[PDB]
Enzyme design. Structure first.
Site, mmCIF file in Angstrom:
data_model
loop_
_atom_site.group_PDB
_atom_site.id
_atom_site.type_symbol
_atom_site.label_atom_id
_atom_site.label_comp_id
_atom_site.label_asym_id
_atom_site.label_seq_id
_atom_site.Cartn_x
_atom_site.Cartn_y
_atom_site.Cartn_z
ATOM 1 N N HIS A 1 6.389 21.869 18.592
ATOM 2 C CA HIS A 1 4.982 22.240 18.445
ATOM 3 C C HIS A 1 4.231 22.352 19.765
ATOM 4 C CE1 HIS A 1 3.854 21.683 13.923
ATOM 5 N NE2 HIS A 1 4.947 22.407 14.083
ATOM 6 N N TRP B 1 15.002 17.417 3.770
ATOM 7 C CA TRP B 1 15.872 18.572 3.562
ATOM 8 C C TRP B 1 17.306 18.083 3.393
ATOM 9 C CZ3 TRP B 1 11.909 18.618 7.147
ATOM 10 C CH2 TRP B 1 10.951 19.645 7.018
ATOM 11 N N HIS C 1 15.455 21.567 10.664
ATOM 12 C CA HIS C 1 14.978 20.908 9.456
ATOM 13 C C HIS C 1 16.081 20.064 8.828
ATOM 14 C CE1 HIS C 1 11.143 23.518 8.690
ATOM 15 N NE2 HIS C 1 10.987 22.601 9.628
ATOM 16 N N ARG D 1 10.115 17.544 16.584
ATOM 17 C CA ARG D 1 9.008 18.387 16.140
ATOM 18 C C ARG D 1 7.906 18.444 17.194
ATOM 19 N NH1 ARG D 1 4.289 18.898 11.638
ATOM 20 N NH2 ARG D 1 4.907 21.000 10.962
HETATM 21 C C1 HEM Z 1 8.427 28.896 9.691
HETATM 22 C C2 HEM Z 1 8.604 27.808 10.634
HETATM 23 C C3 HEM Z 1 8.398 26.440 10.360
HETATM 24 C C4 HEM Z 1 7.549 25.897 9.458
HETATM 25 C C5 HEM Z 1 6.574 26.621 8.533
HETATM 26 C C6 HEM Z 1 7.702 24.465 9.541
HETATM 27 C C7 HEM Z 1 7.047 23.547 8.729
HETATM 28 C C8 HEM Z 1 7.230 22.169 8.756
HETATM 29 C C9 HEM Z 1 6.555 21.228 7.898
HETATM 30 C C10 HEM Z 1 5.513 21.573 6.836
HETATM 31 C C11 HEM Z 1 7.015 19.999 8.218
HETATM 32 C C12 HEM Z 1 6.560 18.670 7.632
HETATM 33 C C13 HEM Z 1 5.618 17.900 8.544
HETATM 34 C C14 HEM Z 1 5.172 16.586 7.938
HETATM 35 O O1 HEM Z 1 4.660 16.599 6.799
HETATM 36 O O2 HEM Z 1 5.332 15.540 8.600
HETATM 37 C C15 HEM Z 1 8.014 20.170 9.243
HETATM 38 C C16 HEM Z 1 8.752 19.136 9.813
HETATM 39 C C17 HEM Z 1 9.665 19.263 10.852
HETATM 40 N N1 HEM Z 1 9.951 20.444 11.499
HETATM 41 FE FE1 HEM Z 1 9.433 22.313 10.902
HETATM 42 N N2 HEM Z 1 8.624 24.141 10.514
HETATM 43 C C18 HEM Z 1 9.040 25.343 11.049
HETATM 44 C C19 HEM Z 1 9.932 25.475 12.109
HETATM 45 C C20 HEM Z 1 10.547 24.429 12.794
HETATM 46 C C21 HEM Z 1 11.315 24.574 14.013
HETATM 47 C C22 HEM Z 1 11.600 25.915 14.711
HETATM 48 C C23 HEM Z 1 11.645 23.324 14.426
HETATM 49 C C24 HEM Z 1 12.253 22.942 15.631
HETATM 50 C C25 HEM Z 1 13.378 23.591 16.301
HETATM 51 C C26 HEM Z 1 11.162 22.406 13.416
HETATM 52 C C27 HEM Z 1 11.379 21.028 13.412
HETATM 53 C C28 HEM Z 1 10.832 20.118 12.508
HETATM 54 C C29 HEM Z 1 11.201 18.720 12.405
HETATM 55 C C30 HEM Z 1 12.230 18.014 13.289
HETATM 56 C C31 HEM Z 1 10.495 18.198 11.371
HETATM 57 C C32 HEM Z 1 10.557 16.748 10.836
HETATM 58 C C33 HEM Z 1 9.396 15.900 11.344
HETATM 59 C C34 HEM Z 1 9.439 14.460 10.857
HETATM 60 O O3 HEM Z 1 10.345 14.103 10.068
HETATM 61 O O4 HEM Z 1 8.557 13.681 11.272
HETATM 62 N N3 HEM Z 1 10.396 23.091 12.496
HETATM 63 N N4 HEM Z 1 8.100 21.502 9.592
#
Ligand code: HEM
Ligand SMILES: [K+]
Length: 294
Positions: A52, A191, A175, A48
């Protein structure tokens, strides 16, 4: 102000071997610090962080992007959209201390590549050359996506990052890793059950689970399954939109296709805004610790 051109500049005298060492250090620390986030490991947060720090890019004026490694500055570091990434940055601190010669942008992006590969994901070619830029080049907050929107929002949002439908659906597959933490984003739950394993489970769960639109403890809506999984409104929009749905079904039925498409889209994401000289080295494909017998 006229758009800037960011030319990749290889860290002086460094080559594949130097970066494989950095990859190895990151991979070894990933294996060592296995207790983080209830034993999920730092894999997900590093992915992530890579996204970001790259996702702030704006194709219209080349601002933001992975090139400058601006996340090291407070404005970006404290972006509400980046809540929780401090854990990934702290993980990389000892790595940067051991290899002070690597740029911040190269480290942030390499961290994501290393995490994906070590978690059994596809190989992701990676190029070096990002150069740190001044604090005044840090992009303002608000360039990362909201999670309470629909397919139209998702499609329009990613056009700024020059990503089409296929690229968007593939990228969202990340995700399949980690989870949402109420304290960070106002959403809670994973997820997938095997959330430190990179696979196409995100798509299978979205298509096969029985979902209910509920409100979490932060008063935000999220789709929940009795299996204990979630899908953000933006994730769920991938099956509400007919064009996205077809691709979701494709990836849920072809693990290799997803891997190949994700690899290409992720490298593109991490390279947006960067101009690579015609004589720059070819992309690097790092061996995993497992492939090296380490
Ligand atoms: C509409 C697009 C996206 C939205 C709105 C979104 C939203 C989120 C949210 C709300 C979280 C939770 C963060 C937390 O509470 O710690 C998350 C986690 C994460 N996202 Fe997404 N995301 C999007 C796209 C993506 C993309 C394109 C990637 C990377 C290729 C990605 C990779 C991750 C990963 C790996 C996590 C897990 C983080 C952890 O477990 O610490 N996201 N995202
Ligand atoms: K998974």
């Amino acid at each position: 102000t006229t758009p800037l051109v960011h030319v990749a500049s290889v860290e002086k005298g460094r080559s594949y071997e130097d970066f494989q060492k950095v990859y190895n250090a990151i991979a070894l620390k990933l294996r060592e610090d296995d207790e983080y986030d209830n034993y999920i490991g730092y894999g997900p947060v590093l992915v992530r962080l890579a996204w970001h720090t790259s996702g702030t890019w704006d194709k219209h004026d080349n601002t933001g992007g992975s090139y400058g490694g601006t996340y090291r500055f407070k404005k970006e570091f404290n972006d509400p959209s980046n809540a929780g990434l401090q854990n990934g940055f702290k993980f990389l601190e000892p790595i940067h201390k051991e290899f002070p010669w690597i740029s911040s942008g190269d480290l942030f992006s390499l961290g994501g590549v290393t995490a994906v590969q070590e978690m059994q994901g596809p190989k992701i070619p990676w190029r070096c050359g990002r150069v740190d830029t001044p604090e005044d080049t840090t992009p303002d907050n608000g360039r990362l996506p909201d999670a309470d929107k629909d397919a139209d929002y998702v499609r329009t949002f990613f056009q700024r990052l020059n990503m089409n439908d296929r690229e968007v659906v593939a990228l969202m597959g990340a995700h399949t890793l980690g989870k949402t933490h109420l304290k960070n984003s106002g959403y809670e739950g994973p997820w997938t059950a095997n959330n430190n394993v990179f696979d196409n489970s995100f798509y299978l769960n979205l298509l096969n689970e029985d979902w209910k639109l509920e409100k979490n403890d932060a008063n935000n809506e999220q789709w929940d399954s009795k299996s204990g999984y979630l899908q953000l409104p933006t994730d769920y929009s991938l099956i509400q939109d007919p064009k996205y749905l077809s691709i979701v079904k494709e990836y849920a039925n072809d693990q290799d296709k997803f891997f190949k498409d994700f690899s290409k889209a992720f490298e593109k994401l991490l390279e947006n805004g960067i101009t690579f000289p015609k004589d720059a080295p070819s992309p690097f494909i790092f061996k995993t610790l497992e492939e090296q017998g380490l």
